[PDB]
Amino acid sequence: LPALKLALEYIVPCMNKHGICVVDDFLGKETGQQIGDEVRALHDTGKFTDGQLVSQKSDSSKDIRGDKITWIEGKEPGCETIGLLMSSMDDLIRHCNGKLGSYKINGRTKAMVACYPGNGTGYVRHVDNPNGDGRCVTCIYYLNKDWDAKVSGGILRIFPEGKAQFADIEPKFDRLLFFWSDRRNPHEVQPAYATRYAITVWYFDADERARAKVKYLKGVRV
Numbered sequence: 001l002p003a004l005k006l007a008l009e010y011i012v013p014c015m016n017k018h019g020i021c022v023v024d025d026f027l028g029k030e031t032g033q034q035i036g037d038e039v040r041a042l043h044d045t046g047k048f049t050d051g052q053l054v055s056q057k058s059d060s061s062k063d064i065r066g067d068k069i070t071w072i073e074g075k076e077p078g079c080e081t082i083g084l085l086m087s088s089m090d091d092l093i094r095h096c097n098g099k100l101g102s103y104k105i106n107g108r109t110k111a112m113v114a115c116y117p118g119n120g121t122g123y124v125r126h127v128d129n130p131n132g133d134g135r136c137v138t139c140i141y142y143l144n145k146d147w148d149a150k151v152s153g154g155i156l157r158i159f160p161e162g163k164a165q166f167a168d169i170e171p172k173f174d175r176l177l178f179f180w181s182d183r184r185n186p187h188e189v190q191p192a193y194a195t196r197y198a199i200t201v202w203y204f205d206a207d208e209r210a211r212a213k214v215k216y217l218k219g220v221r222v
């Protein structure tokens with residue numbers, strides 16, 4: 001689908017009604033697989049961190065580490081289909097802008113590529129932006145071929161604020177997810193028992209970000 005049709009007919013209505021939006025088959029199989037290939041090359045060539053420290057034992061040979069990450073700008077050698085994904089996410093947001101609540105989105109982070117190594121680690125319940133650091137929208141792309149959570153775990157579970165229910169999102173190949181980054185969407189990743197990849201970017205609201213400058217300390221000489 002053309003970005004604008006997806007934006008006006010799906011992302012804008014879903015985001016304003018539910019604060020969560022899932023688009024399946026975002027880029028198609030060829031491109032999705034190429035992204036899988038590039039992420040796997042990053043992993044295989046040692047570009048990820050070792051992983052979040054999950055269990056600190058007094059013996060460090062038995063430390064457990066979880067999600068591994070690497071920040072990707074999209075123009076690096078071997079990351080160009082990742083850059084293509086980032087640009088397609090941006091096209092969608094650009095065609096939403098002015099219609100996502102009353103936010104005015106004026107930028108985004110680099111891509112955070114995540115690798116859950118499959119050792120029973122997940123990601124604890126959290127809010128992405130709990131303290132007003134400028135990020136208003138979380139965008140995640142999943143590239144896990146034939147993922148079956150009943151077998152491999154790794155569900156993303158969101159707990160929309162105020163609701164007595166949660167939303168389980170499988171990290172399915174070629175799946176695109178949007179949700180409000182703030183306290184309306186606490187979420188977690190349940191333990192993953194197979195290698196699980198995701199690519200996240202966060203979009204900034206202009207006003208909040210302009211205040212996060214001072215809430216986060218920048219100076220100029222006299």
Ligand SMILES: O=C(O)CNC(=O)c1ncc(-c2cccc(Cl)c2)cc1O
Nearest residue numbers: 067112114123128140156171187189198
């Ligand atoms: O993988 C999924 O399906 C869901 N992942 C997350 O929700 C997540 N959220 C936040 C973070 C994160 C939180 C703080 C700092 C940094 Cl660099 C990353 C990582 C994360 O992996």
Ligand SMILES: [Mn+2]
Nearest residue numbers: 126127128187
């Ligand atoms: Mn998160």
